[model samples]
Target chain A: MAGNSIGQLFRVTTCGESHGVGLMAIVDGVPPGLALTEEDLQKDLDRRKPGTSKFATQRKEPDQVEIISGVFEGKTTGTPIGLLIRNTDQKGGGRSSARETAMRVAAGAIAKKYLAEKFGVLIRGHVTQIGNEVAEKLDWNEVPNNPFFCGDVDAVPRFEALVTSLREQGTSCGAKLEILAEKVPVGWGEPVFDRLDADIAHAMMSINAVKGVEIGDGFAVAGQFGHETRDELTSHGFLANHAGGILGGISSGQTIRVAIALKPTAKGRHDPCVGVRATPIAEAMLAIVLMDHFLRHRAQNADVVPPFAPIEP
Target chain B: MAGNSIGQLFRVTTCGESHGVGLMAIVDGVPPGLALTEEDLQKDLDRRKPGTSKFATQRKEPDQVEIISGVFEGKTTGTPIGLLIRNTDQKGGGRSSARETAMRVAAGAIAKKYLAEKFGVLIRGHVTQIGNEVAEKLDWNEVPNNPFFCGDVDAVPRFEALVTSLREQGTSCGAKLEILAEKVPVGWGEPVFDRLDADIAHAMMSINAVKGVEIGDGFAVAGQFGHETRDELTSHGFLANHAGGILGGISSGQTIRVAIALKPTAKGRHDPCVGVRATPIAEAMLAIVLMDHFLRHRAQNADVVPPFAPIEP
Candidate 1:
């Protein structure tokens, strides 16, 4: 499907090539009255900027993002958000490069912010592994401080050493990541095909080098028995979530967990460790998916009740 | 994000659930220039029907399908196809019931017929497993002859016995099906996430009761090595079909293969064996996916070259 767009209600369609006149995105289905601005989107864009990170390509691009339409008086007008990111270094931008994710980050920032403000829903993603190195622990404070968006502050030097070795060897490797959404209300997903997890996989799979996708303990359940996989519901809420906060394809009012396997691919003009800056892009796609499903769920079952009271973070 | 829709470019948005008067679908992005008719769509709706094409035809009156717009004087004018189906039995049609798929069949018929005459794309699906009864051998000729849509003429009695047993025991079983598309040109799927395989997963997973989906040795690949799975390119064509005709998410100009696993859901109103009438719905969804991708491919890279001459069935 010439396949440039994703999502149903909150549709995101993109145009412009890597090096064309820059990249653009048209995001639809934003509920009116949410606050949005150029600066709000740029924060996410800066994180995705190439050359800003030593772990990325040295080729520099201003990567400045602009919000052209869909907002009035600092609030979204329930229209399609048209985002523009003019490539200062548009030297024939690879259509599928993470460079393209700049638009996604810009568009996703709006979703993340709105979802955060309206429902207290939040999204965060971090790299757990780069090449042969694995972060032993996660500290969200260090994610934004480091270029890798790695949650492990102690592992930063090892990540750098690995990148340096790859440069000298001219060899690229893969990465493993986790993208999470918290404070997500139960019933944010559709049953069956439009399941939140299905769309999450769809959104994440659309990125360039994502080798595979898994929800919760994904493939691990293949060997486990029924009792091991099913969550035990208690008056105090569920005990242990192997379903990845999803049950019967709908969010179970628990933290949404996604595991990603990405192979480094941009060839000559790409980062040796592609996952270094992928955290925002993954977060962006997840925000878009959740934002969309939240809207759809609200629309279809807006006045419905949950199995239990809303969870408090 | 009220997501009562699917697809990009060739979009399908639906409303009016199981009962509540009826069901409707509006299909967008149909390329102008092609003939269409209500009868064309009715042909597909009849197969998903319980009373139709007179397979032991029981209740008969009208399972009529109306194509109100998007077509003029028998030819489509590149507008969205609007379809409607009245809930003749809507005493409170379960929103997720198979009755919802009637519109899918109606809309997919357009996609199926268009891709057929325009690009020579053809889709077919049949029951492989029903309950504990499996079709020993497939005979395409018999698919339309029985209400079961089973390819094996010899297994019809066993399937009937199993259904009767289920009804008597008040227990239902799951079904397994295989869907195929032939003469699909190369480069029909997008790489990474919007990939033909990924979207196929999205579409099939959208159907009610579908437990899991696999594309060309999907989970089996976890057990095998590179030599067992990769399709070797030859001067003539690919020697092995293990890749399911998709390489790196794009079609390899070979027959597309899909396997669907469906569990029995839908409470009191469902057929004991839901897969009996599932064949046409599967074909419809496949048609929509392929047709949508065709439009997107033509838009994004219409002038691109394939690895070889187009295949002939």
Candidate 2:
């Protein structure tokens, strides 16, 4: 109901801010009988943990996330999953901090697990641009090798050099991050205002410091001709993805493309380029939107089937 | 979880489209012991009903709304409120007809009633613009006398003439409507993405024909100087409402102002300006937002009190 939460059916409400003992999140709408555990959540929680890299907050806190409720016998019981991540690092008015996102990444792990096993949906993200340095060509395998989460290994040295310069100069810069969703079924968005694009924008924009979000060719379409921008259909698939895998606000069975900009002002006690730590948050939000929309679409159009399989190349 | 619902705490999720036997709405989070009945919801349902005037849709619908659940002896049980409004009219793929909004209006009536009784919240909307006809000055008493919900009685004749002319011309024009909420407490919005302005925009934009929405001097700030635009706070109160009663995405304890543009293409067998009937939908959305924010704020900041009472003159 409040902005602290997102998605219906798969509703996720968060509590506990920067100054609280830790954080709390209530994830409702997960169906019963899907394998889940504290470990599954910990994988992302550890990834989101701070002090693992010098680029992020230096607070040496082991923000271990816990599942206080909702799962039974190693499976979700269809009740709201209550997640608790104690602020082992004494940390308040700033309710949304990187620590808070740890809960999100944890909650997202559940949604990601469900989306993966249920629909073969795969969501991932990488720091594409930071300060003046930009990664070239995505190589997802390289994301885990460095703290920047850059998919392209070639960009790591430059990223480290930029952070080193900013750290010493007492200055910071913004970064561009991209999130992608693969194997999402067609017809996963609501018509009108709750369009997939609208909610996706809503999801990422919910981040406190995220100043902008773009779906595919977001602002570029303004200068494009209608004929140039429209995604053309053919026997094989869509000729291009100017529409960004979404049409009429629903998924088109193509990989969803999303980009967001994180302001540089979070430099003090934060990542020189916040997007480095924010990749999981973006991925979390994207996964939440997809899972929520999937249930929403199914609730209304359980029997709806496209004339042909979604047009994907 | 789907677009069919709005709010948390006081969440409202709707089902049953136009062709269905009847529309259904589940309003979760109403506290127990509020006096309510089908008749209370009926008043607004009647107001939003089509065929009440020659200028609106001609389909005669006895849209008698019924309370199917969540009530006990004329009082709410704090459970999800179930609302039903039958089509009596085979109305579907066109799921979001004015009829669907009937459900919205009904659900809003409950929110309106609760806000009025609990916090002295008063919400009302009036037709200010329809094609070439614009109302002059607001006179709350005059709103109920016309089908257009125009607060200015002096504009009735021009509105009548415009609709008559459009009906004869076989085409229609767009309209601009204004909705206001008074007695809203300060801090009624969530910060960051769920900002009061953000959700208010989301709420209004959810309407099908609503192409644009403005909050207090919306786009006008573009040309206004910074000194002229910022709402200067004084010991007395805010000098102006350029921010539409919201500053920093939280309510400023002032009269909230919002305006929306409803397209005229709905003129085919519809109201020349659908905003005539949309008044209730706008009010409902506003009420839902306020109530949800109130509950959400309480859930988080219940014990905290503002340093000074909200400023109003």
Candidate 3:
């Protein structure tokens, strides 16, 4: 039903297709009085552009982003942010392709800056699985290397082997991604239906080719007993995190962990793992969800302080 | 942030805790000309109300829904529908409870009827699983007989036994539900991120207590090859439905199928399968999503028709 929008309060509505003349996003509800610039968006957009690696699409795209509205004099005006990304890579076949995620990354960069500067919330994403293989460990520093986007340097060869095998087989491979948001305060989620995790699932699943999404243990809870699944609260913090940093549909103030599965494209003989490029978009989606919740939490409970001491994750 | 609302054009925004004074929903984007009454909403509200069975909550809820606005002279005025349902069972511990699904069912009924009468779209839902047990077969006629909402007559006793065992454990059980929409036209989806399936996943995942959601084969696609996953179209229609009646993010005139998993509640010792009761709500959600798309489709391409003849599911 004209489904271009996500979030309330800090809302985002995107228009245009992958092969359309351009991509446009209207980011609303951003607070006033923060420094913003097209350069702030270009950093993330460049990371999402194709042809950066041998595994990516060969078409070189200068996906320069523009802020048509919502900012003035290099400061946000507390209005809707209108962003445009012209498709210079007009081969015309990438209609509804991964390129659409670039706009989300751009819009999300602004939200990410606002959340970090205003509230100290930080978001990041990493590749957790490619095809049927899962990385045993991750190092944040190693994420920038390797085309696979795996954080474990030792597992780069394994990912390379899988990609080589996928190319030889003339098929594509899928990927699993995990996004984490840290330093969020408690009471950010709405009650009953609008759980923080629930909204996160909506945002992640809305991304193209994402088939599965889970928060915390997610479906794994189906295998565990109730006594073992519920996170036990201790004096300093929670003793366990089976609830994935959420309790009673509200954030427990721990790091919000979200895992999503992206299906591989079957169109070409040598297809890259979709998850490799999804990290920025996943991070963006997380930012939009949290930024919207931040505004919402402030609106509903601006004066309500934490009843209990904050828990350390 | 505020997750009370869903959909784009034909939208639904709900407010109120479980045991609060009342449940309220603002049903927006409904077209004018349909004859509506409180009775239209009450029929579905009664279906979603608790205390209807021995396995359900003992507190009886009159659950009477009122039309506060959006209608005039027994007909819709093409405005937002404001609905309210007062809580008669006021012992007041049901905050963030399943009782919140009532307004969704009520609001969905109007959308359901509108789609049915105008576009020949029919929607229905049935419980497919309770706990780890999956139904081998379903008889749509038998769905209304058992409290578990399993459609198979032979499976009723098995579901009853599961409910009995769950009560003794002082825990609730999870459930699986599937909703189907028939006779929906093609070209009802947006490209790239806002796909029909993607939007459906968002709407279903937004439901309270829902842990997982899938469309068609869903996670099963992860294990399949590309050639087998794509639904092959023939002269008459699709040979198979691995794509779940959707291709390139648009409907293919096949029955739209959606499945969701609901987590159990721990409050009432004798809680029925949450998925059992979720059928009506799921059906309602599918209706709301489809109705919104109907309006959007008309708005975007009112003059266009299908280039190919309609297909039979």
Candidate 4:
């Protein structure tokens, strides 16, 4: 069941599962020599790990990542780079079968890394909702320090209160998260069809339980007038980057951002019955994306094919 | 040089160069018994054919597409379907070398038709510019009737004039064209780096002589404010689709579009340059993509697993 690979130039494949062996990603297409290691993987994994705060999962997992292949002497070899993240503690059934989604998540991570390493594109996602929880006044910097990986700290109490109230009612719901990436290159796609944005829609919807997604002014642009919806450019960078850092299908060299709505854990005592048996089961689901802009985020280009920097970034 | 295939689950790999025996595509993963044949392939090639108008290349060749494999007794056998399009005109580029961009173009047409028949997707390209001849009022329907597969009728005169002028100059410049497809399914891709948009970009950019490309908002979204740049929805399907039918790296079930800039033919010269190379060397550089989304688009359930289709669309 090691069918966890995706992409052409920059590919990502994952191994292991929620309760199986350690989670690992075999990133293909990474440019050779970028000085990566366990520290690099943890720098980002820490934010997604549980047990970080009261609002987060109670499970204890450090998400310690290891580089098993693809790199040599702290540098890339232009071959497939293997990233392993051991499962510290695996428990849960029913909707807790995040292992089933590990392969999809591996593809996502590979995508993210490829974009960053190849085109120098930046992408980030923010928790827009959390199991009947909501936060106001985004602080941005609080993302890494917060349990939900949110940008607002002042609204933590409100979020906590909502979660508590929902639990008391013996029911669980879902949350909506927002993601953004910027500095995308221009002249990247076509028109009438094959728009870059349409492609984004296809990718975003691949995630499990991703009920909703939007791009560039999103649902709101439908209501605005033609003049109000048009994006105008000048000598300076965009005056207001509501286009979600993209215009047309190609990159405008701006931040790429996205918002996602995720249904709460599928299995839990408080997750009230909708159609199935009321009894909670040991099951879980997990979905992830490689958020890098450059498609070959994992490409190494070790064989030396002219232009020292194999990727265009 | 044989790398003319795209997509994964629903892949389209084309073979044969211009002036070769014929052009063909080896499609993998198409449903069985969908009722297809050479006629279906010819239908699309007819639309992309040159010599139909004065503006198109005056090469007289009968493009007859044939289905050689993947079907049994007029029913699909759940195997790789090989689609072949025989070329009637094989006067140039003998058995030694096959270097005709038109061969790829013919294969692309067949792929697009196959996609349209299987899925309700429409792929079409409009010539935005011909050399220095710029067209006003882009039209999609008129492309089939035009010689250059151009979208705008008004620019025909200017294009004709420009071609005449360029021929006299003994030097040629490049032009830009746009290709569009519609009815892409939503939630079809991973986010961030693996975004559908990025994948499309890599696919299009990898084509030969593709110097520039654009999606929806193109490069003009940089000047707008966040409030003005988004593609929001309203009572209607969408208030302003400036986002070009895509959001968050996923298709919005809307039209997909792309614009391409093609450099002048490297060997295009009515009269050789002053350098006056010893002989009129034969050379070709071009890239083409299919009009079908299924080349890589995947549907859920029986569409993917066992007891399923084998031919790629």
Report the error of model 1 at residue B177, Å: 4.4
Sort candidate 4 into its docking category.
Answer: incorrect
Between which residue pairs do clashes occur in model 3? Answer: none
Q: In candidate 4, what are the lDDT values of residues A210-306, reduced to their tens digit?
A: 3334554443331221123224563434345555555645546555555444333323435321111100000000012233223322232234343
Model 1 earns a TM-score of 0.66
Q: Write the per-residue lDDT of candidate 2 for residues A1-313, one digit (tens) a residue.
A: 3467677688888877666687888998888888999889877777764335553434454567788898898999998889997876542322235665676788889889998888778899988887778799788888888888888888999988988877766566767788889888877888644878767766775554454455665434322222222245633334366556776567887788887766554234434565577888888888888888878877886486656554343
Error of 3 at B7 (Å): 4.1
Tell me the tens digit of each residue's lDDT in model 1 across A149-170: 7889889888889877776666
Query: Which 10 consecutive residues of model 1 chain A have the lowest summed lDDT?
Result: A221-230
Q: Candidate 4, which segments miss by more than 4 Å at Cα?
A: A1-11, A14-24, A28-36, A39-313, B17-24, B52-63, B71-78, B85-111, B114-119, B131-133, B192-194, B229-238, B267-313
Point out where model 2 deviates above 4 Å: A1-3, A8-186, A191-313, B1-4, B49-61, B70-74, B77-80, B90-96, B131-137, B152-161, B191-194, B220-225, B228-237, B266-271, B300-313
- For model 1, what is the alpha-carbon lDDT of residue B215? 63
Cα deviation of B201 in candidate 3 (Å)? 3.1
**Candidate 1 residue runs with Cα over 4 Å from true position:** A1-16, A20-96, A124-180, A187-202, A209-280, A293-313, B1-14, B25-43, B49-84, B90-96, B126-178, B187-202, B211-252, B258-277, B296-313
> DockQ for the candidate 1 complex?
0.12
Q: Give the whole-model CA lDDT for all candidates, comma-separated.
A: 0.73, 0.72, 0.73, 0.48
How would you encode candidate 2's per-residue C-alpha lDDT over B127-159 as one tens digit per residue?
788876778899999988887888888899888
Write one digit per residue (lDDT tens) for candidate 1, span B85-197. Answer: 88777233234465667777887888898889866877998877876677888788998777687899989888788877777655566677788898888887875358887
**Would you estimate the TM-scores of all the predictions?**
0.66, 0.59, 0.83, 0.50
**Residue B34, model 2, lDDT:** 96
Looking at candidate 4 chain B, the ten consecutive residues that score lowest on lDDT are B276-285
**Residue B50 error, candidate 1, Å:** 8.2
